[PDB]
Amino acid sequence: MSFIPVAEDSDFPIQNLPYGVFSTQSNPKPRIGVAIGDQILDLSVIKHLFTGPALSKHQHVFDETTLNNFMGLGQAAWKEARASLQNLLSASQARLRDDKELRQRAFTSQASATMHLPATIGDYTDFYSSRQHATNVGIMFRGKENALLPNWLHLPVGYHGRASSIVVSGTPIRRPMGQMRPDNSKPPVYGACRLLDMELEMAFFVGPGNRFGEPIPISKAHEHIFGMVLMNDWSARDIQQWEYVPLGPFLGKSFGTTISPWVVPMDALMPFVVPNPKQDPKPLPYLCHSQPYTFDINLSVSLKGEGMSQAATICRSNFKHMYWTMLQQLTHHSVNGCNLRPGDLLASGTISGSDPESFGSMLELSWKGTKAIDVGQGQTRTFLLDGDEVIITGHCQGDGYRVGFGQCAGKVLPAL
Amino acid sequence: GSMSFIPVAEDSDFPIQNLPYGVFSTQSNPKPRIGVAIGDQILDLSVIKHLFTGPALSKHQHVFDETTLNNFMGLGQAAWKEARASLQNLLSASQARLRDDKELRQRAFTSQASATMHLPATIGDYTDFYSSRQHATNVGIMFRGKENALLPNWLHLPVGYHGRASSIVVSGTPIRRPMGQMRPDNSKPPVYGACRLLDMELEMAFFVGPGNRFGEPIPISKAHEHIFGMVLMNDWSARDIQQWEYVPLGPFLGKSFGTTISPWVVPMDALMPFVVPNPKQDPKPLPYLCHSQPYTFDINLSVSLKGEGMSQAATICRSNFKHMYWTMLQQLTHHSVNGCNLRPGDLLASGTISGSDPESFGSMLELSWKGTKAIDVGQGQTRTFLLDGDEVIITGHCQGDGYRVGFGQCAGKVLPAL
Ligand SMILES: [Ca+2]
Ligand SMILES: [Mn+2]
Ligand SMILES: [Mn+2]
Ligand code: NA
Ligand code: NA
Ligand code: NI
Ligand code: NI
Ligand code: NI
Ligand code: NI
Ligand code: NI
Ligand code: NI
Ligand code: NI
Ligand code: NI
Ligand code: NI
Ligand code: NI
């Protein structure tokens, strides 16, 4: 089904076909591509091959420097694009395989490519939808009997994030300065954050908007989910704890948030859908959906420090843990008439399962700095050190192939 | 004083001392474009852009051809100062260049009355601060209790939260009463329905000029270089939705259904004549928040409410920006201290501007004390929270000798819920 060979270890078989923005040494202009094997198929080069009804008059979306306009076309266009790509790669429509002059312009090596943020993100929201993550933060901060606050099981709690500091995989992250209060009996101090953390999340991009004042009913929520990326919500826990009452996390989150560049479309993930977790209490009707919209995605996080020769896997978790689905999050986010826009990023929350090996932050893995995490070669961590590199990966396991997400990586630079 | 060839009423918001920037279109020409308000006219900068011949602007005249102010904001203070001096000259009663060019005036001016204003910039990120000591005290009492009403961090840093950028709308945009989830009965599950405690919040906000690079703080001594100018803002709020949702991650759907700004961006140079010494802070802030430069402004603010049956709008709040405890310089410095990258056109709002006098409380949550006191809105008529069809208008002015620097309107009418 693909004339482009795909190795067994590839994140990018024919069943994936994610969208990203890339550039090369020869042509520095960011442009839209699709990953296949170790190659990128350049959609600006092949834009004229999308001849179907939804795209024939809208080929210009493939000439843009971001995915926003393609996202905003909606599901008929996404489905047509994916079918066109499938038919070109199988050579059912043989133009791309057989037009050698087009072909040699259209495919470039991933290894030689530079990736960019896939969209101009107008608004970013971070949810809090893993019951074990919220419970753990609760146990650590408020105690076992108060682990979950009263609203949590009733709505998908979330907060507005900082869009400007969402950066693409591979961007170094500087340890932030700020204010903290390490001794509650004394005034706060200014200094480098001491409790620098990662957060394993996933996120989706919004497709067509909704108009200002017009909620998206849950029945239609699936029409607005374009596809998914990996996210690391870097966090400065000492800055966070001091600032956050009563208006929520702010500078403890906004110094950096990393996403992976390849946006895996929802149609690629639908084969990996599983039943939705039972919610008790049942949510209010506006949040109810029968459609399965929970996904079996195997997630891993590695840490490698300065001097260390091998990265250690510190977390293995799964997106299927989450209590509230993306449909519920999208619907709740628009219930009040808030206008979601193409390229908005809605993140899941930190993805922790019940097994401590699956906790999605070092705040949890180290239990607030009370337990050392073994990172191999005689080294241990509670929170991140200068020079540490964190890499998140994710895969769906098919029969004889995997749909992978590439990398969501960053290295910590010293405070300056 | 100082005079334009364009006639200006004594109490006009838009004398030659102001010269605010905005984005407008007309019935003749739908392209949104950059203008400056003067008297009851707009001067179209796209038409006169070739008159900006100075060193900061001569190679950057295209910023005046844009559909938003972002690029001009991004050029920084030498460009802003050069544009303002060029406009003060061009609009002067004693300057012939534009005054006597009949055909150019025909193309360059249009009446405010027939213009449609648009949002002045594409706002990448919006942040709302919480910098009125009285407002934070009042909401603490009403949502949480008198004990620690002002929470332990408030006197040490300018508390703020990330707001929703997409739902910042220009003055005049109707605001639909939001649906959502609320918990009016503590002994029952939450319910879904129309908000019952719909509120306004009197704020001001500033737009960021040049940004800072990702990872690079803005030191407080340079913060003034990044503040372009100000608008009025109404942070519409759904207090029942807010109270149920906000612990522990903050206000969310209780704010994001709509936030209105006025369209004319008053540049900081226009406001500097109205600067006053900063309020004393005790405890003294940490050094990174310590600045001697005066950056508190005497701006008289007013809020009116007009019900769907009324002929006279009632003034329900009179307050002043000079009441705020933390300055814009402190807010911008704190926002970037961790390396967060502010970008041109970002909007940083002050917080609700409540003074200590109850007549200066900047929200109906406060003026009605969470529905326990009636607000007088005219003969016989009262409010606690906003009703369908109510129109809220925020205005603001700095008063000089024989002129004002005004802000135009920040208006919205409440539509019924779905
Ligand atoms: Ca934003
Ligand atoms: Mn997070
Ligand atoms: Mn507010
Ligand atoms: Na972050
Ligand atoms: Na609002
Ligand atoms: Ni892989
Ligand atoms: Ni062509
Ligand atoms: Ni069409
Ligand atoms: Ni309950
Ligand atoms: Ni204190
Ligand atoms: Ni099978
Ligand atoms: Ni004079
Ligand atoms: Ni006025
Ligand atoms: Ni230049
Ligand atoms: Ni005064």
Swiss-Prot record, chain A:
Q: Name one Pfam family in it.
A: FAA_hydrolase
| Gene Ontology annotations of biological process type | arginine catabolic process; L-phenylalanine catabolic process; lipid metabolic process; tyrosine catabolic process
- Give the pathway annotation: Amino-acid degradation; L-phenylalanine degradation; acetoacetate and fumarate from L-phenylalanine: step 6/6
Tell me its EC number(s), please. 3.7.1.2
Q: Which InterPro entries match?
A: Fumarylacetoacetase, Fumarylacetoacetase-like_C, Fumarylacetoacetase_C_sf, Fumarylacetoacetase_N, Fumarylacetoacetase_N_sf
Residue positions binding Mg(2+): D233, K253, T257
List where the protein spans the membrane: none
Query: Which positions bear Phosphoserine?
Result: S84, S92, S309
Q: Which reaction does it catalyse?
A: 4-fumarylacetoacetate + H2O = acetoacetate + fumarate + H(+)
Positions of substrate binding: Y128, R142, Q240, Y244, T350
* Tagged with keyword Metal-binding: yes
Q: What keywords appear on the UniProt entry?
A: Acetylation, Calcium, Hydrolase, Lipid metabolism, Magnesium, Metal-binding, Phenylalanine catabolism, Phosphoprotein, Tyrosine catabolism
Q: Which positions are catalytic residues?
A: H133 (proton acceptor)
Supply the Gene3D superfamilies for this chain: Fumarylacetoacetase, N-terminal domain, Fumarylacetoacetase-like, C-terminal domain
Tissue specificity as recorded in UniProt: Mainly in liver and kidney.
**Annotated binding of Ca(2+), by residue:** D126, E199, E201, D233
- Per its UniProt entry, which superkingdom is the organism in? Eukaryota
Q: Which Gene Ontology terms cover its molecular function?
A: fumarylacetoacetase activity; metal ion binding
Q: Which residues carry this modification: N-acetylserine?
A: S2
| Subunit relationships | Homodimer.
Q: Which family does it belong to?
A: Belongs to the FAH family.
* NCBIfam families per record: fum_ac_acetase
Q: What is this protein called?
A: Fumarylacetoacetase
Q: Tell me what organism the protein belongs to.
A: Mus musculus (Mouse)
Q: Which gene encodes it?
A: Fah
Swiss-Prot record, chain B:
N-acetylserine, modified sites: S4
Q: Which Pfam families does its entry note?
A: FAA_hydrolase, FAA_hydrolase_N
Taxonomic superkingdom = Eukaryota
Can you tell me which residues bind Ca(2+)? D128, E201, E203, D235
A molecular function annotated in GO for this UniProt entry is: metal ion binding
Name its co-factor(s).
Ca(2+); Mg(2+)
- Does the record bear Ribosomal protein in its keywords? no
Read off the SUPFAM superfamilies from this record. FAH (SSF56529), Fumarylacetoacetate hydrolase, FAH, N-terminal domain (SSF63433)
- Organs and tissues of expression: Mainly in liver and kidney.
Q: Where does substrate bind?
A: Y130, R144, Q242, Y246, T352
EC numbers, comma separated = 3.7.1.2
List the catalysed reactions.
Answer: 4-fumarylacetoacetate + H2O = acetoacetate + fumarate + H(+)
List residues modified as Phosphoserine.
Answer: S86, S94, S311
Q: Does the keyword Ubl conjugation apply?
A: no
Pathway, per record: Amino-acid degradation; L-phenylalanine degradation; acetoacetate and fumarate from L-phenylalanine: step 6/6
| Keyword list, A-Z | Acetylation, Calcium, Hydrolase, Lipid metabolism, Magnesium, Metal-binding, Phenylalanine catabolism, Phosphoprotein, Tyrosine catabolism
The GO biological-process annotations, alphabetized, read as: arginine catabolic process; L-phenylalanine catabolic process; lipid metabolic process; tyrosine catabolic process
**Residues that coordinate or bind Mg(2+):** D235, K255, T259
Active site, UniProt feature: H135
EC category name: hydrolase
Q: Which PANTHER family does the record match to this protein?
A: FUMARYLACETOACETASE (PTHR43069:SF2)
| Database matches in NCBIfam families | fum_ac_acetase
* Subunit structure, as described in the record: Homodimer.
Q: Which family does it belong to?
A: Belongs to the FAH family.
Name of the protein = Fumarylacetoacetase
Species of provenance: Mus musculus (Mouse)
Q: Which gene encodes it?
A: Fah
